[PDB]
Design an enzyme around this catalytic site. Structure first.
Site, mmCIF file in Angstrom:
data_model
loop_
_atom_site.group_PDB
_atom_site.id
_atom_site.type_symbol
_atom_site.label_atom_id
_atom_site.label_comp_id
_atom_site.label_asym_id
_atom_site.label_seq_id
_atom_site.Cartn_x
_atom_site.Cartn_y
_atom_site.Cartn_z
ATOM 1 N N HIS A 168 0.854 -1.176 0.000
ATOM 2 C CA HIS A 168 0.000 0.000 0.000
ATOM 3 C C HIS A 168 0.900 1.239 0.000
ATOM 4 O O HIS A 168 1.770 1.372 -0.864
ATOM 5 C CB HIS A 168 -0.902 -0.049 1.240
ATOM 6 C CG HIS A 168 -1.978 0.993 1.266
ATOM 7 N ND1 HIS A 168 -2.510 1.549 0.124
ATOM 8 C CD2 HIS A 168 -2.659 1.537 2.303
ATOM 9 C CE1 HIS A 168 -3.474 2.390 0.455
ATOM 10 N NE2 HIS A 168 -3.585 2.400 1.771
ATOM 11 N N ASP A 214 2.651 5.990 -6.174
ATOM 12 C CA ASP A 214 3.897 5.792 -5.439
ATOM 13 C C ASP A 214 5.147 5.806 -6.308
ATOM 14 O O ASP A 214 6.271 5.851 -5.794
ATOM 15 C CB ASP A 214 3.865 4.467 -4.687
ATOM 16 C CG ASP A 214 2.735 4.391 -3.700
ATOM 17 O OD1 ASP A 214 2.494 5.388 -2.981
ATOM 18 O OD2 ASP A 214 2.095 3.324 -3.637
ATOM 19 N N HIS A 256 -2.266 -1.683 -9.434
ATOM 20 C CA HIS A 256 -3.276 -1.045 -8.615
ATOM 21 C C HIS A 256 -4.508 -1.925 -8.681
ATOM 22 O O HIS A 256 -4.812 -2.488 -9.737
ATOM 23 C CB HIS A 256 -3.582 0.352 -9.171
ATOM 24 C CG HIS A 256 -4.253 1.261 -8.191
ATOM 25 N ND1 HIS A 256 -5.612 1.234 -7.957
ATOM 26 C CD2 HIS A 256 -3.746 2.197 -7.353
ATOM 27 C CE1 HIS A 256 -5.913 2.112 -7.018
ATOM 28 N NE2 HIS A 256 -4.798 2.710 -6.635
HETATM 29 C C1 LIG Z 1 -1.086 -2.883 -5.582
HETATM 30 C C2 LIG Z 1 -1.084 -4.399 -5.860
HETATM 31 C C3 LIG Z 1 -1.128 -5.128 -4.482
HETATM 32 C C4 LIG Z 1 -2.395 -4.757 -6.600
HETATM 33 O O1 LIG Z 1 -2.441 -6.141 -6.853
HETATM 34 P P1 LIG Z 1 -3.841 -6.893 -6.662
HETATM 35 O O2 LIG Z 1 -5.026 -6.111 -7.318
HETATM 36 O O3 LIG Z 1 -4.039 -7.116 -5.146
HETATM 37 O O4 LIG Z 1 -3.587 -8.260 -7.517
HETATM 38 P P2 LIG Z 1 -2.601 -9.443 -7.260
HETATM 39 O O5 LIG Z 1 -1.560 -8.902 -6.334
HETATM 40 O O6 LIG Z 1 -3.374 -10.660 -6.817
HETATM 41 O O7 LIG Z 1 -1.998 -9.617 -8.745
HETATM 42 C C5 LIG Z 1 -2.395 -9.725 -10.159
HETATM 43 C C6 LIG Z 1 -1.200 -10.254 -10.999
HETATM 44 O O8 LIG Z 1 -0.432 -9.046 -11.437
HETATM 45 C C7 LIG Z 1 0.965 -9.285 -11.111
HETATM 46 N N1 LIG Z 1 1.380 -7.974 -10.613
HETATM 47 C C8 LIG Z 1 0.631 -7.019 -9.895
HETATM 48 N N2 LIG Z 1 1.273 -5.882 -9.743
HETATM 49 C C9 LIG Z 1 2.553 -6.140 -10.144
HETATM 50 C C10 LIG Z 1 3.830 -5.369 -10.088
HETATM 51 N N3 LIG Z 1 3.885 -4.179 -9.558
HETATM 52 N N4 LIG Z 1 4.952 -5.994 -10.643
HETATM 53 C C11 LIG Z 1 4.854 -7.159 -11.407
HETATM 54 N N5 LIG Z 1 3.767 -7.958 -11.383
HETATM 55 C C12 LIG Z 1 2.651 -7.425 -10.763
HETATM 56 C C13 LIG Z 1 0.894 -10.201 -9.927
HETATM 57 O O9 LIG Z 1 2.180 -10.806 -9.698
HETATM 58 C C14 LIG Z 1 -0.150 -11.202 -10.335
HETATM 59 O O10 LIG Z 1 0.382 -12.311 -11.022
HETATM 60 P P3 LIG Z 1 -0.471 -13.723 -11.356
HETATM 61 O O11 LIG Z 1 -2.025 -13.513 -11.725
HETATM 62 O O12 LIG Z 1 0.479 -13.926 -12.618
HETATM 63 O O13 LIG Z 1 -0.163 -14.752 -10.174
HETATM 64 C C15 LIG Z 1 0.090 -4.890 -6.840
HETATM 65 O O14 LIG Z 1 -0.094 -4.270 -8.121
HETATM 66 C C16 LIG Z 1 1.531 -4.619 -6.270
HETATM 67 O O15 LIG Z 1 2.034 -5.428 -5.377
HETATM 68 N N6 LIG Z 1 2.176 -3.523 -6.743
HETATM 69 C C17 LIG Z 1 3.508 -3.180 -6.182
HETATM 70 C C18 LIG Z 1 3.260 -2.364 -4.901
HETATM 71 C C19 LIG Z 1 2.685 -1.007 -5.178
HETATM 72 O O16 LIG Z 1 3.189 -0.196 -6.024
HETATM 73 N N7 LIG Z 1 1.637 -0.731 -4.477
HETATM 74 C C20 LIG Z 1 0.939 0.605 -4.446
HETATM 75 C C21 LIG Z 1 -0.404 0.624 -5.147
HETATM 76 S S1 LIG Z 1 -0.870 2.337 -5.474
#
Ligand SMILES: CC(C)(COP(=O)(O)OP(=O)(O)OC[C@H]1O[C@@H](n2cnc3c(N)ncnc32)[C@H](O)[C@@H]1OP(=O)(O)O)[C@@H](O)C(=O)NCCC(=O)NCCS
Ligand SMILES: CC(C)(COP(=O)(O)OP(=O)(O)OC[C@H]1O[C@@H](n2cnc3c(N)ncnc32)[C@H](O)[C@@H]1OP(=O)(O)O)[C@@H](O)C(=O)NCCC(=O)NCCS
Lengths: 370, 371
Positions: A217, A306, A256
């Site tokens: 987050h 971010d 996101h």
């Molecule tokens: C924000 C976040 C948690 C959203 O993910 P989510 O909606 O909860 O979805 P999931 O985490 O279950 O992932 C979906 C897929 O996208 C991939 N993915 C998601 N964001 C990714 C990233 N930043 N880098 C590479 N792969 C990513 C995941 O590995 C996953 O792979 P799979 O279906 O091949 O197993 C995720 O994008 C992330 O960890 N980003 C990095 C942290 C970040 O910048 N967070 C701030 C958000 S504003």
């Protein structure tokens, strides 16, 4: 099973519209790009708390009101002296809000009027807390608020010890506005989850800060900067991403739950980052953006808020462990707003369930027979 | 729109099964009544964290591992001295946990083993924090944990300043077991919401405590005792109930979001309340309320919940109403930790919902001068 609560609309809101497909953001209907350019933190905070733009006098009084509430009580400032200075700033902030909560003789009061009043104090005081933490990390003394400065300008002044240039203040003001609010993200949602038990504002906000801290987050803030440093030079960025993606790890600052497109806030921040850069951090980000983008963009994974904010905060004098607290200094306005809205519009205890996959009628086997 | 997230199933779990229709509860498959009779907080904690009963050596080592983690660091004990004595006990605890995490050099380590290890520390220390709070509330000094006492006995000891009789210890132990775990209630869900951002354990637990502080969660306890007090004597219990329902006001300690039958934890507490009752007034008023209010409420699927009888048990153990929720936390921390371990294991997804948007779109930024 609504894993991650994705797609679950648990309540109604007027505060924040996010179009994840087209990449639009509105605060009570007003596009964020408009607000970032024209508004201030105070004005956007009024908007988020009151649901409409303030009139001239309203804004003037609302800003003086916040300013009057910036100072921390001696007790809390005295407490800061023994706060582990090596502790993460979010944990500092988390503790400060909780302790501040103890100092409130009517902490538990959650009437709409009390929430608003206590919220004004938190919104105002967050900057002072984070700045105090920063001064303490530096082996220096916390600086009292200057009521004559805007919230943004004062935050910089307390954090850095010198009144910021108007440009610096405007940059900080823009960043605060961009992070002020964003629907039912993890931290806002956590605050509402907590508040849904009718707990006090401080508890809900301590919980929000707790949640924001996570690198999934708001903690992605400093993580991206960690990424930049690890990369070191723009010359190493491409291969870095190649191998980062090869070991199937995630690129911080991208992706996101909602945005399946460039984050409209990152869009703005990218432009501010570009201006500060004119620069290795920014060059590195652009390469990561390009190189990671070509595999992740087609998956709906784009730079988020971010991604570029750190370049901005760094320019404003902050080290990376303060990136998320700066986030919190803004988002507190949105949290208070959401708590006020949730109370008005819904105010139901959140109590979800799971899909049980365990066992039943397992015996309690006598100790000596296990 | 899923108001209250009611019926929303957002993850999979093995820890707790709540049979809302028949009024049954299990911790990893084991009926709560069994653990309340036979297990101990340390063993049930082991169960909640490991998903199985411990072997004899395991339990013994586990108990000892918790026992040596009971003591709070001098730094925190010192900070307590300035915590406002008039502050809410849950605010004391919320702050204590947060400040404790600051003292942890690897606060943000959230690997499974680090969560387990830090979770043991919190489980062990929650009793010590709440007990210190109580001592400080009374203008007294916290009492160092004693390793030779079980978690429950030690809790009473640190809280009351005197070693509890085996009977009292057994009551507390049973009470902790009963409140140790209960699915994705508000506090647990909030812990997970926080932890789903991959924030540190203390942040997640601080959030859990923030939730639990709410009167809508873990509170009723006090409200039942207030109810009992406002009823005053069993002689006016039935009448009070009839008038209370006629006012269309709720009867504390009955009804549950999931249980549409008698709370199985209330079932255990009812027998324990009767034990302490043999001041029977408290109890007799409660049984009369149960009966008179139940003839009306039971058919609507509302029965006494865990909060109906627990107050009677806690005040007998020497705790004023305002420590009821803290005592709840002293037990639930085991389930919170267990849930964080499980969530990481089984799901570990960011909790990020949405809301139905009923606001405006494309509102112009009107100039200040023109507003
Ligand atoms: C924000 C976040 C948690 C959203 O993910 P989510 O909606 O909860 O979805 P999931 O985490 O279950 O992932 C979906 C897929 O996208 C991939 N993915 C998601 N964001 C990714 C990233 N930043 N880098 C590479 N792969 C990513 C995941 O590995 C996953 O792979 P799979 O279906 O091949 O197993 C995720 O994008 C992330 O960890 N980003 C990095 C942290 C970040 O910048 N967070 C701030 C958000 S504003
Ligand atoms: C837990 C609680 C919030 C659940 O409420 P709920 O989900 O609305 O309960 P149900 O869905 O079974 O309710 C059907 C009706 O019973 C009424 N009802 C249930 N709880 C009641 C109580 N304790 N006393 C009297 N009537 C009650 C409801 O108000 C509702 O109103 P209606 O005839 O106006 O439609 C409620 O039972 C309550 O407030 N309990 C009292 C305090 C307490 O002990 N709770 C804490 C532990 S959960």
């Amino acid at each position: 099973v609504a894993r991650g609560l994705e797609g679950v609309l648990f309540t109604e809101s007027r505060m924040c519209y996010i179009d994840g497909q087209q990449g639009k953001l509105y605060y009570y209907g007003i596009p964020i790009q408009e607000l970032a350019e024209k508004s201030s933190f105070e004005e956007t905070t009024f908007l988020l708390l009151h649901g409409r733009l303030p009139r001239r006098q309203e804004l003037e009084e609302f800003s003086a009101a916040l300013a009057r509430r910036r100072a921390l009580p001696a007790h809390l400032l005295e407490s800061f002296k023994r706060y582990p200075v090596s502790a993460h700033p979010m944990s500092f902030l988390r503790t400060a809000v909780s302790e501040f909560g103890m100092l409130d003789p009517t902490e538990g009061d959650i009437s709409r009027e009390a929430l608003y009043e206590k919220g004004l104090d938190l919104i105002a005081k967050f900057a002072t807390i984070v700045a105090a933490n920063k001064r303490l990390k530096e082996g220096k003394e916390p600086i009292p608020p200057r009521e004559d400065l805007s919230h943004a300008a004062n935050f910089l002044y307390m954090a850095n010890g010198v009144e910021p240039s108007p440009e610096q203040a405007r940059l900080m003001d823009a960043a605060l506005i961009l992070h002020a609010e964003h629907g039912f993200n993890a931290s806002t949602f956590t605050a509402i989850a907590a508040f849904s038990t009718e707990t006090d504002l401080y508890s809900a906000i301590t919980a929000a800060v707790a949640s924001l801290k996570g690198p999934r987050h708001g903690g992605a803030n400093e993580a991206v900067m960690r990424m930049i440093q690890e990369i070191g030079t723009p010359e190493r960025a491409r291969e870095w991403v190649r191998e980062k993606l090869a070991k199937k790890e995630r690129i911080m600052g991208m992706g996101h739950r909602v945005y399946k497109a460039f984050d409209p806030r990152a869009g703005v921040l990218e432009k501010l980052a570009r201006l500060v850069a004119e620069s290795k951090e920014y060059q590195i980000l652009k390469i990561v953006e390009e190189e990671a983008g070509k595999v992740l963009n087609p998956r709906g994974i784009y730079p988020n808020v971010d991604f570029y904010s750190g370049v901005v905060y760094s320019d404003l004098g902050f080290s990376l462990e303060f990136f998320t607290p700066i986030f919190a200094v803004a988002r507190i306005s949105g949290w208070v707003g959401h708590i006020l809205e949730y109370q008005e519009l819904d105010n139901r205890l959140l109590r979800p369930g799971a899909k049980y996959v365990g066992e039943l009628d397992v015996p309690y086997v006598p100790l000596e027979a296990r």
